[PDB]
Design a protein around this ligand. Sequence first.
Ligand SMILES: *[C@@H]1O[C@H](CO)[C@@H](O[C@@H]2O[C@H](CO)[C@@H](O[C@@H]3O[C@H](CO)[C@@H](O)[C@H](O)[C@@H]3O)[C@H](O)[C@H]2NC(C)=O)[C@H](O)[C@H]1NC(C)=O
Ligand SMILES: *[C@@H]1O[C@H](CO)[C@@H](O[C@@H]2O[C@H](CO)[C@@H](O)[C@H](O)[C@H]2NC(C)=O)[C@H](O)[C@H]1NC(C)=O
Ligand SMILES: [Cl-]
Ligand SMILES: [Cl-]
Length: 561
Amino acid sequence: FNSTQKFIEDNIEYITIIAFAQYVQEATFEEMEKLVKDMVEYKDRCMADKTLPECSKLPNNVLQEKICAMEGLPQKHNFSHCCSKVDAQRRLCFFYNKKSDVGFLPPFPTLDESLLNHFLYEVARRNPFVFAPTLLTVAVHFEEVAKSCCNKVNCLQTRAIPVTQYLKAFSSYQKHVCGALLKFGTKVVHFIYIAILSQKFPKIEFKELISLVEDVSSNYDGCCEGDVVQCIRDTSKVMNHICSKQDSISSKIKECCEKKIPERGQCIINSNKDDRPKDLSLREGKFTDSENVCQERDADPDTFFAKFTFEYSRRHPDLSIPELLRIVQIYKDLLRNCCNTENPPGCYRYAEDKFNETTEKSLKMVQQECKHFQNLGKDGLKYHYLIRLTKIAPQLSTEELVSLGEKMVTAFTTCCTLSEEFACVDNLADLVFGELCGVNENRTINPAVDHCCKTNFAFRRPCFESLKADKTYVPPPFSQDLFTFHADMCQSQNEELQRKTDRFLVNLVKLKHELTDEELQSLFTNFANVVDKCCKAESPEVCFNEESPKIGNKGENLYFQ
Ligand SMILES: *[C@@H]1O[C@H](CO)[C@@H](O[C@@H]2O[C@H](CO)[C@@H](O[C@@H]3O[C@H](CO)[C@@H](O)[C@H](O)[C@@H]3O)[C@H](O)[C@H]2NC(C)=O)[C@H](O)[C@H]1NC(C)=O
Ligand SMILES: *[C@@H]1O[C@H](CO)[C@@H](O[C@@H]2O[C@H](CO)[C@@H](O)[C@H](O)[C@H]2NC(C)=O)[C@H](O)[C@H]1NC(C)=O
Ligand SMILES: [Cl-]
Ligand SMILES: [Cl-]
């Protein structure tokens, strides 16, 4: 508690900036400095004589009251609805005020302890759900990278790509878990963390595991709401707990546990899975071999299924978290049928065959996907996913479809060569569909997608992969200029030329949504061939208009279907 209390008081400036910038993404840096002043005053007035009326209140309620008391702010950035509520309803309104879609903001500025203040402000408002320990550790990595630049501005933009990659990996997992908490409730977060921690810390004992999962679950309730102070406290408490029982949890965290807040926690999260105990059997037979499974379930169902997840997950370090959860659900459903029959021990005896069956099906699928990646390359496989994604979710904006497609192919670029490609691919690919379904909102894309988002956490990815083209789709008009090529397209440009190509393909699939995937891929390759040839020509402009495939159908020139 007391080291954590010191850390919070010493970093109150950074923490205040994170909270306000995440909650009110439109607020300016000058307004951040206003709230920093008022929060530093609050800190001092509490240290000097704690016994005050305002010192008793929770730090998120205090922060939100002072945001709500700023002259004109609620109405200026459209959050007066939240200030007109109080307490839990206000806190909930502020959580709902966050926008994952940060297109409305400009590009990220070029920096040349105000540097950290500015970095934190600019990162936090663009990543409104990322937890504070992650963000404060990202900034410490930015200070080191900044300082290793003696064109020192362009030195900083390069070299920050690994820092940015560290941020997005963490926030992608945090958003997936928070999204799951909103849509499915705390029970599912518990089962996610039973699987994760059991897999990562296989020598841990069940009772200590369940204790640790309760701590992590409470950490997520605070962090997902956006309560930065509580998130720092609850995260420290998780890491204190792990480091105090270190030799009974993991032999891989020695160096981590010697570090300070908040690097300690990030090291632990990043650490490798601990090795399986020598004496750990290949299978725990009591879930299938015993004749008393149904009564053990009936004595305490949630604890019984938690124990199953623990015992299965620590023995299967090569399954993804979604695959473990699918296995839990299959075991649960098998016992729901079996335990009301005349001979329950009979049908549940071979549950491991159902488990092996689904695992084999999933592994085959990933093998096939990685073979397509090897055959086609990154871009080739990206175009296949852009077509499929646009077919099933054509109501999404083209920018979002392109982002989702880029994230989907990066799962394969990261995972396919590695040992244990199956776990890596399936874990990363699950995050992509998580992004699709929303963090702090229930999104309305189309009925079939909405059904996959909301019905079942563990079976979400395979639900989506079984969807056919959205036959409900009525496209808006598209202007001809979306499909025209300009002379600027003919140079060795950055990956904003790749984003232009991706946008073209997505818009094309929207326009021509009734064509087959093969016909769309053929039409797209026709356009690419024409750009390859016309970019070698003198005057590419005229070449494109006299060699491009027709997309319209005569008497229809500015606006297509
Ligand atoms: C379900 O699938 C699993 C694996 O996907 C099957 O596990 C295999 O079971 C056999 C015998 O039960 C294991 O044999 C052992 O192999 C090790 C090799 O290091 C050897 O040292 C031991 O003495 C022993 O012979 C085998 O390891 C294991 N396979 C794997 C990959 O772990 C299991 O048979 C399937 N269960 C059902 C009910 O279908
Ligand atoms: C988004 O969907 C979730 C999932 O149904 C909603 O959560 C439910 O909220 C009601 C009361 O409003 C509770 O009775 C349920 O227990 C909640 N379910 C779960 C699983 O937590 C949530 O209200 C929706 N949010 C919005 C803004 O529409
Ligand atoms: Cl975020
Ligand atoms: Cl920590």
